[PDB]
Paper text:
[name] ([name]), in particular, is a powerful restriction factor of retroviruses that blocks viral replication by hypermutation of viral complementary DNA and inhibition of reverse transcription. The lentiviral protein [name] inhibits [name] packaging into virions by targeting it for ubiquitin-mediated proteolysis, and through ubiquitin-independent mechanisms that are poorly understood. To target A3 family members for ubiquitination and degradation, [name] hijacks a host Cullin-RING ubiquitin ligase (CRL) complex and a transcription cofactor core-binding factor beta (CBFβ). Here, we solved the structure of wild-type human [name] bound to the substrate receptor module of CRL5 containing [name]-1 [name], CBFβ, Elongin B and Elongin C (VCBC) using single-particle cryo-EM.
The crystal structure of VCBC and the AlphaFold2-predicted model of human [name] could be readily fit into a 2.7 Å-resolution map of the [name]–VCBC monomer. Unexpectedly, well-resolved density was observed for a single-stranded RNA (ssRNA) molecule sandwiched between [name] and [name], most probably originating from the insect cells in which [name]–VCBC was co-expressed. Four nucleotides (named NT1–4) of ssRNA are wedged deeply between [name] and [name], with RNA forming a sharp turn mediated by a hydrogen bond between ribose 2′ hydroxyl of NT2 and the phosphate backbone of NT4. The [name] CDA1 and CDA2 domains sandwich the RNA tetranucleotide at the interface formed by [name] helix 1 (residues 15–30), strand 2 (residues 39–41) and a 310 helix (residues 42–46). The bases of NT1–3 are bound to [name], with aliphatic interactions, aromatic base stacking and hydrogen bonds to NT1 and NT2 typical of sequence-specific interactions. In contrast to sequence-specific interactions with purine NT1 and NT2 with [name], NT3 and NT4 are stabilized by aromatic stacking interactions with Y59 of [name] and Y30 of [name], respectively. Buried phosphates of NT2 and NT3 are stabilized by hydrogen bonds and salt bridges with [name] (residues Y40, K22 and K26) and [name] (Y124 and Y125), respectively. The arms race interface is comprised exclusively of protein interactions between [name] and [name] and is adjacent to the RNA interface. Residues D128 and D130 of [name] are buried deep in the arms race interface, forming a network of hydrogen bonds with R15 and Q83 of [name], respectively. Furthermore, W70 of [name] interacts closely with W127, D128 and P129 through hydrophobic interactions.
Author numbering:
A (entry chain C): 5 to 157
B (entry chain A): 7 to 382
C (entry chain E): 7 to 46, 57 to 112
D (entry chain D): 2 to 80, 88 to 96
E (entry chain B): 1 to 176
The structure:
Amino acid sequence: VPDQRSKFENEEFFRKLSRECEIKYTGFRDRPHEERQARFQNACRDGRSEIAFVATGTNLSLQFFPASWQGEQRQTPSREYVDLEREAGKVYLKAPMILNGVCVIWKGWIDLQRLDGMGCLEFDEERAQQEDALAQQAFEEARRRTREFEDRD
Amino acid sequence: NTVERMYRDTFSYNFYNRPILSRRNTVWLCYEVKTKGPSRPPLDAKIFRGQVYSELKYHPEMRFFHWFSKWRKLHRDQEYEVTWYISWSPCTKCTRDMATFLAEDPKVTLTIFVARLYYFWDPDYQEALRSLCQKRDGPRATMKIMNYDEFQHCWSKFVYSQRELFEPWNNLPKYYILLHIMLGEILRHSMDPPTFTFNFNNEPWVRGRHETYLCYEVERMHNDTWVLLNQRRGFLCNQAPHKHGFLEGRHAELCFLDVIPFWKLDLDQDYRVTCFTSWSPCFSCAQEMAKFISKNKHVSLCIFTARIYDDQGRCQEGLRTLAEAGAKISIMTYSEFKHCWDTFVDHQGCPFQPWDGLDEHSQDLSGRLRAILQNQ
Amino acid sequence: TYGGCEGPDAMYVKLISSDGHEFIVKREHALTSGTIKAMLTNEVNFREIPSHVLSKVCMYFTYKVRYTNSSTEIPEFPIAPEIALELLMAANFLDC
Amino acid sequence: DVFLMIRRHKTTIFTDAKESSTVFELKRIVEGILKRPPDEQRLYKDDQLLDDGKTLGECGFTSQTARPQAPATVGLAFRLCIEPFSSP
Amino acid sequence: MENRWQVMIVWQVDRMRIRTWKSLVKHHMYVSGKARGWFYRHHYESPHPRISSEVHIPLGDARLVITTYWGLHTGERDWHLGQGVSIEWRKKRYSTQVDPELADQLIHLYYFDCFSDSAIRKALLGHIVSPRCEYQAGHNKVGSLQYLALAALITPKKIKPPLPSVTKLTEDRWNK
RNA sequence: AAAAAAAA
Ligand SMILES: [Zn+2]
Ligand SMILES: [Zn+2]
Ligand SMILES: [Zn+2]
């Protein structure tokens, strides 16, 4: 856990920096604005479609897929959600992930009037100790290695 | 870049219509251009060449449209019909660009004949195809599968065939019918109301119903719930005997069983296939369906028939054995007729209008089917 | 840069080129080399390394320290074949 | 931040600083190593003497001029010799 | 009852890059023995409605999965970016999303040819160095001065067709 | 018989 936190705070992170970044909903680009808002809001309510949010200035996008499509449900010590209650005109997104070996939470908010908003990344302290220690150690050892001058001729 | 004709080996290698072929990395486009009106020889006809992996500007479709846009200027008050014979169906980018091109040009009609369907399982390609062809508010573009006549025309007019007759390969008709069913599924083709009304009448005394129609849909199991696979839905009919097609014509049931394995259903899941037929299966088709159902334990079969087809008494044995295999056989009632009308017919918003004596005929047929399946 | 080289906490280690040039570079940057790190007294004299080789190795120190943690859009590090073998010799000596 | 080169009398120092840093800051940097008062010195660039009051932007030098792989080169003098590096 | 989701990081790419990636992976799995041991899963082997293909790469006792995706509405206005890629590192029930550059770096630890330990010693004795690195996408970090110098004096091999790279597959071209 | 397709 201390190594994970140190990495998160001090490492050029994944190309997805923890700093606040403007994000936008990309779905149904072509269709008119009102149609886009209606479809996005309906998808957020239903939970039957998929929803994607892209960082405005890059190539990275976060995809929420229905947990059914994956097949076997994955055990979730922490909870992700798409809430539509804390504010009248905003949707709040919470998504735990494991990136490059460190557990994180991505938190975002989208304004349904404009279909854009802000997202950020934070360190997750709860699940780091719950995850298997052997797999953490294996990935850590693997990523510390270099191919060069390693093979024994 | 164009060539007048292609060699015999080139044609035989490239226009072979097995739905899944590798190592066909070139696209050949034979094109003809004519003027609307009485039949006359094409004004221009040639062949374009390309590689699938080349740049989009070098694809034969883009090259044809670039050539045509310039050549089209000589007489702009002329309205043209264009025919393509293409070994691979255009790609997703070309499909979209042709849609735009045809939207630009109102005085041009395009008919495309394809030997094979390229990437027919890609959802994005399917959407682009529906935009190009299905959409009646979009461009007037038709797409069809090459049959014997089209292959023979290409052999005659676009091949170096020195006094040599066209010789079909082994499974030309089988592959054609598979591809025809797949394309109809992708384009969401619909039955016209007259065909439905004439073929699906359940009056016991019918005159002139020599052909059997079959509408199919598929459902998948999940969370103890049947979820429709909107991709798998369509209709088909029997193939009349033909010297160039099937010598003794193929029954709709056999075509359906042929197309099922191409869907690549997962053996670890559970599926339900529902068929609505105007005639119940014959004895041989019932035997084939029973064998299929016995082998493929991951598929359940449901048959709803408008009429009971009986001949020589083997039909009752066939229905009995098909039922014992594990299929469910029933008689179409008001609900099923209305559902088929609303799902598989081009009703244009019109409501389903039942005919005279529907309910009584349904009841009599249900009694007959109960007697058949109970008595043995 | 108020840190006094003459003192124990130097803030700068002196490097003497075999050719006759002398540079000075922060202790942290020299720490990236195993030999100098083990040696470090506040002065280092290299028996063989020419002046230009010393300049290139120090520029590499700067570069790696600047981009040691960054893993995005790393710029190129120019090298020339006529100096490649001697630079490699220097690096092998220094365990850079 | 950027990195700088100062060469004079077969002597050199490698150090980093910020963009808007004035030449007074550069002289303060070199003071801790040269033990010589700042305003006495005068920098040199392209064999042009640098006055006591000078700024990066006013000088026109930019970040793209000085890189970790190719830092900007300027000479120094006391109360000038642009001595080249050794050659193969 | 609240809904449930899986969250992925998907790099938006164009279908042409996906096609080439598939072709290169297949060519080096079958025609060349270089990517032998990798597995390719067709679209019809996955229940996922959006999965287009999977490439599985054994890494010792762990595994690297590159997944391509179909029919994402996120595609650009010009449909420059309809499809997507994701990278995962799995071992037993543990999984982690992986950066494309770290992905190539982890791949190169197991599969292609690199300079041997005796490469430096041979080079200063003026001899010929072999094997020499042929996968430069596996050295995308800031390596030691030794590696940079050696790679300078002896050039890397240029395989044709190029070995498959996760970095080249998921590199931002639309926005640059 | 196989080719899910730049595996040529
Ligand atoms: Zn095309
Ligand atoms: Zn029959
Ligand atoms: Zn290597």
